[PDB]
Design a protein around this nucleic acid. Structure first.
Ligand code: NA
Ligand code: NA
Length: 327
DNA sequence: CCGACGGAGGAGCAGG
DNA sequence: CCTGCTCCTC
DNA sequence: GTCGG
């Protein structure tokens, strides 16, 4: 489906999804609009009526009449009303700052704070995460081309190995699927001395090392198993400096590693279909484990995983390269 | 009509 | 001073 | 909001 096929409908749906998530605080309506927006973005026809799209799974009654109004008028009275509503469109924008969710964006707006400059003039009311998110507001919305993502992986792998050569570090996300651009770098990390029962400064030593070589610049949150922070590639001679990028590093036990590697590689749709055969054939998948069913349904014990396709094999799927796990 | 819709690690303070 | 849940992210 | 009980 081309850039201008049902793009008017899909943009409007995701715009409704954003309003529901940020303003209404209805993550399930938000996921519902995203689902209908996704299934229409794979529909190989131009829609002429709401009932035409309602055949698709995820599109129902209320969305069909929203599609019907859009076709007739090229707009939606409600959606256009939401745009011009100063307090709703303010809550929407403020959530684009990392660390400002739907709950904090309303507090800011009700006490008059509605812009970045308003936030920069009220640093006292921001926590550490939100001060960083405000600082790199422009950088964090930029995409990361693959060439820079691979240079970023060069540093991560090089410094990870030089702390302990038995660390296993895998960069996941769309980058692992050959995507020409990413939004952030996701790092999955494990060590043979950490299992479901296991000197776990392991995440700390890795984070510290990338800080000393000045890859990591800021810390949004840091704990035993999960790191979220900011990084930046070094600048070359007199050329302008690279934008700061979001990076997360997780320490997963060695047994649950390839479940996590599978899950955090995506795509989620690809996980929604793969998740949805496992149960078809008697297995339940989550981020951590593959577990057998379950003649009523409820299950017991996690099984051994030593490779990503170890999971593919019990489900009995020809291993799919990350190259083609778009769905 | 009603319940499910992914879910957990980490940060952090209003109430008393 | 003590308590302990909401928020955010991906 | 939608789907499935
Ligand atoms: Na439908
Ligand atoms: Na945000």
């Amino acid at each position: 489906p081309q850039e201008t096929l049902n793009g008017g409908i899909t943009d409007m749906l995701t715009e409704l999804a954003n309003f529901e998530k940020n303003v209404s605080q209805a993550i399930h309506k938000y996921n519902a609009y995203r689902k209908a927006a996704s299934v229409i973005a794979k529909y190989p026809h131009k829609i002429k009526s709401g009932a035409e799209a309602k055949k698709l799974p995820g599109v129902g009654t209320k969305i069909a009449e929203k599609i019907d109004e859009f076709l007739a008028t090229g707009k939606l009275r409600k959606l256009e009303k939401i745009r011009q509503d100063d307090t709703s469109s303010s809550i929407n924008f403020l959530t684009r700052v990392s660390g400002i969710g739907p709950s904090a964006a309303r507090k800011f707006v009700d006490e008059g704070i509605k812009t970045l400059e308003d936030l920069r003039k009220n640093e006292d009311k921001l926590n550490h995460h939100q001060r960083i998110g405000l600082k790199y507001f422009g950088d964090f919305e930029k995409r990361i081309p693959r060439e820079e993502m691979l240079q970023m992986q060069d540093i991560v792998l090089n410094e990870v190995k030089k702390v302990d050569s038995e660390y296993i570090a895998t960069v996941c996300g769309s980058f692992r699927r050959g995507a020409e651009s990413s939004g952030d770098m996701d790092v999955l990390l494990t060590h043979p001395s950490f299992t479901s029962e296991s000197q776990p400064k392991l995440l700390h030593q890795v984070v510290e090392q990338l800080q000393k070589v000045h890859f990591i610049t800021d810390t949004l949150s840091k704990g035993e198993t999960k790191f979220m922070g900011v990084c930046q590639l070094p600048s070359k001679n007199d050329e302008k400096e690279y934008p700061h990028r979001r990076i997360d590093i997780r320490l997963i036990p060695k047994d649950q590693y390839y479940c996590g590697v599978l899950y955090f590689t995506g795509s989620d749709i690809f996980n929604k279909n793969m998740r949805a055969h496992a149960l078809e054939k008697g297995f339940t998948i989550n981020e951590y484990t593959i577990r057998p069913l379950g003649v009523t349904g409820v299950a017991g014990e996690p099984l051994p995983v030593d490779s990503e396709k170890d999971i593919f094999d019990y489900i009995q799927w020809k291993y799919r390269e990350p190259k083609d796990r778009s769905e």
